[PDB]
Design a protein around this ligand. Sequence first.
Ligand code: OLC
Ligand code: OLC
Ligand code: OLC
Ligand code: OLC
Ligand code: MYS
Ligand code: MYS
Ligand code: MYS
Ligand code: CA
Ligand code: NA
Ligand code: NA
Ligand code: NA
Length: 297
Amino acid sequence: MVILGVGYFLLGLILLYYGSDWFVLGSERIARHFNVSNFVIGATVMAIGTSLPEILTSAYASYMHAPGISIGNAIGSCICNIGLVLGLSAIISPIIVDKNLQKNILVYLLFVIFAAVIGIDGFSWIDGVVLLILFIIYLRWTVKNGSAKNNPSVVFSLVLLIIGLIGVLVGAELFVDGAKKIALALDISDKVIGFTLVAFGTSLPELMVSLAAAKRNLGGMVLGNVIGSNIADIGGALAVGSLFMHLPAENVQMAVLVIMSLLLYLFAKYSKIGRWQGILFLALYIIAIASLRMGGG
Ligand SMILES: CCCCCCCC/C=C\CCCCCCCC(=O)OC[C@H](O)CO
Ligand SMILES: CCCCCCCC/C=C\CCCCCCCC(=O)OC[C@H](O)CO
Ligand SMILES: CCCCCCCC/C=C\CCCCCCCC(=O)OC[C@H](O)CO
Ligand SMILES: CCCCCCCC/C=C\CCCCCCCC(=O)OC[C@H](O)CO
Ligand SMILES: CCCCCCCCCCCCCCC
Ligand SMILES: CCCCCCCCCCCCCCC
Ligand SMILES: CCCCCCCCCCCCCCC
Ligand SMILES: [Ca+2]
Ligand code: NA
Ligand code: NA
Ligand code: NA
């Protein structure tokens, strides 16, 4: 039991580690095949693939009548994605953002502010429908602006991508299940801590994929994955949650998200996303996890 837990834990780590690199390599190749930028592949295929845990989690939680957990997971993931994931990644591989990606980040910022505003009284199913529609528009706009028989180069590419994605998603689940089994076996299970960590657990794919990308100096891919995952987490995970049940407002967390998103845009536009920007993101992240209410909703 503690043995099974340790087994899952370690296997999950392995699958996350190697799976993330395969996913990145396959995504980079697919981007070159389709003549789209690494940012675009990161913001679309990679972002959505890695946010599937958040979407399922938020949908399931709201369906099980725990809408606090549903929104806690969605918004907590956005804060994790900028504070921790981008924070670490930016230090590893500093990013200078080109003029068109800047505009994409501005649209991201507007989307986040819009979500925060309509969410002041919580999120209804109509809020969800609107956010989903905007999510869809964002994707098509993003692909438009970043765009332009059986080929073994392409087949290898898609195999790498899909196997890598399977690797990071199964790996994250094993890692989390393994940790939970260890905690249970050692009699240190704590539901409040466990629910606090839900957003982190679902963000393990983004974490490892972004770090793999950053190691290969693929900064546009990192930024696309972070921006796209947050939009997927709001227009997808949060949105679907709100379809099952009204989601209670999380105004403090949304304000933290809006602040981090604003900083991300300002750095992108007027500076760079490099070492000291990443240090700031991590510092704000650490302050957030030190001070936000526990329990993940
Ligand atoms: C992704 C492309 C753009 C991204 C970001 C741009 C900002 C969008 C905000 C204005 C349009 C909003 C849609 C139409 C107006 C809906 C207003 C609203 O409040 O919808 C929810 C409603 O409150 C439920 O009762
Ligand atoms: C398309 C690009 C050009 C247009 C860019 C527009 C950007 C607007 C985004 C932030 C402003 C806030 C939006 C105002 C929406 C508030 C609606 C509202 O108050 O809805 C209450 C309802 O109860 C909620 O569920
Ligand atoms: C502290 C070191 C962190 C290690 C990284 C692992 C992150 C995932 C752990 C649980 C997330 C989802 C749990 C959802 C259900 C909670 C059930 C529970 O009570 O688990 C509590 C226990 O303390 C949990 O270790
Ligand atoms: C060989 C393998 C190399 C792997 C290298 C990965 C580097 C890990 C970076 C931060 C880990 C965080 C440690 C504990 C995570 C808990 C954070 C938390 O509190 O999450 C709250 C919320 O759920 C979400 O913001
Ligand atoms: C023109 C290329 C992009 C087309 C649009 C792709 C839409 C994919 C939608 C995925 C949404 C996942 C969450 C559903 C709730
Ligand atoms: C730029 C506007 C973003 C809004 C950020 C969300 C938090 C809303 C602050 C409201 C504080 C008062 C709440 C009383 C119900
Ligand atoms: C490639 C060299 C990287 C070295 C940069 C040091 C990283 C500092 C991270 C500090 C995190 C700050 C949180 C609050 C103390
Ligand atoms: Ca609302
Ligand atoms: Na994602
Ligand atoms: Na995720
Ligand atoms: Na997450």
